[PDB]
Every structure is written in C-alpha cells, then in structure tokens.
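[Automated response] Your request has been received and processed.

Submitted sequence:
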Amino acid sequence: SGDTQLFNRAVSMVEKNKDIRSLLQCDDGITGKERLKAYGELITNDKWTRNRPIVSTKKLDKEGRTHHYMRFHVESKKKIALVHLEAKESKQNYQPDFINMYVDVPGEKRYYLIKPKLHPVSN
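Generated structure:
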C-alpha cells in the first residue's frame, strides 16, 4: 500500500488546494465543486497516449537514504496538471515526509505545494 497511500495523500492535497483548482479552471460553483479525475503519468509512443499505473521510483541520496519520486496527473474538464512528488521515509512518523511537491499546468507558473528545505538562494 506504499504507493497507493502516497498517491492518495498527494492527490488529496492537490484537489483541495484552492490555487490549484483555479489553475485547472475548475467548474466550481454554488451547485458544487467539479469532480476532478486523476491517473498515473501519461506516456505516448507518438501514436496514442495512455496513463501508466501509479507507482514511485526509488533513488539513493548521498547519505544512503532512499527517496521516492512519483508523478501523476489531475484533470479537469479544461486542463491537465502534472504533479511531481518526492518523499522519503520518516524516522519519526509512520507516513513518509514529503520533500518536494509541485504542479505543472500548461501556461501557468509551476506551483509548489511543498517547497524543499534546500531552496534556491533567490527564495
């Protein structure tokens, strides 16, 4: 359930974020909020596009600790966002720590839900 919980937790954060919903141009009104759709990373062979299963990939850092990277999409009737997540096992919590998380919507500035501790000097 590692990747499943990671994805459920992440997509839930994205969906509830007012700014992200605005970037996705959600049809949110007095009758209710648009029901967004989510799926794994979109891949193509240049013939047709499809979503890959939701999964994370692992990569070791300089301290010998494993980081998990996961990409998925959130789609509204008008836009598709690409969400990137980096997480790492927490030595204190059950759930892993979210290290970096951003959302890319075409034509919009990359939006960080979780800004890394290690940030550009021009923060």
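Summary generated for your ticket: The CA atoms of residues 104 and 110 lie 5 Å apart. The chain has one domain: 1-123.
If you did not submit this request, please reply to this message.
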